[PDB]
Design a protein around this ligand. Structure first.
Ligand SMILES: Cc1c(O)cccc1C(=O)N[C@@H](CSc1ccccc1)[C@H](O)CN1C[C@H]2CCCC[C@H]2C[C@H]1C(=O)NC(C)(C)C
Lengths: 99, 99
């Protein structure tokens, strides 16, 4: 698709058989989803947030479908105010910025 | 231009004789710049990021040149981790996400 920016670029994603809404986010390096359980081993991780670091859980090699495009990559889980899809997965689905 | 997302989408911006670098950020509603004195009336504002709120000054009708494109609109000024071009100006320059 082509997604304009008059409104927040939010799309439906599918992960672990669950459907969620997530923000296509070119200013984030990583993909961060709200608190949830995923299958497998995870590592503790700190990401740079407002007023300090935010603690998240890192899951690697997770299949995730983004607006019907398949990715397999790293998903961070934690207390984000919004589900965000970052560059690690935007590149996998062939997403560019254009003007 | 097409901008890929293998690295941070950073571009040169000009505002009023200042020449800075900033992220083209589809995840940001509004444009947020690091320390600079802009002319005109300001209004205090609190804006959400991961891990907390940043207190900013909101200025209206600020010209920024972005990759040779002329934008004019709201600019927020505060302790932001990075200079950010948000949707309010990204739309003005005709920026879309494509995949
Ligand atoms: C999540 C993430 C990573 O995993 C790695 C690197 C950066 C980020 C990251 O937080 N990126 C942000 C840019 S602000 C920024 C922060 C740190 C470094 C560079 C830029 C997002 O693109 C924007 N981010 C998207 C989104 C995040 C969840 C809360 C709602 C918005 C808030 C918005 C935001 O933070 N707003 C500002 C006021 C700071 C502009």
């Amino acid at each position: 698709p082509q997604i304009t920016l008059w409104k927040r670029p939010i799309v439906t994603i599918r992960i672990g058989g669950q459907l969620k809404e997530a923000l296509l986010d070119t200013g984030a390096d990583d993909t961060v989803l709200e608190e949830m359980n995923l299958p497998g081993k995870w590592k503790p991780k700190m990401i740079v947030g407002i007023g300090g670091f935010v603690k998240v859980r890192q899951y690697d090699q997770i299949p995730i479908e983004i607006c019907g495009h398949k990715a397999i990559g790293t998903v961070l889980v934690g207390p984000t105010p919004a589900n965000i899809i970052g560059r690690n997965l935007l590149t996998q689905i062939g997403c560019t910025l254009n003007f």
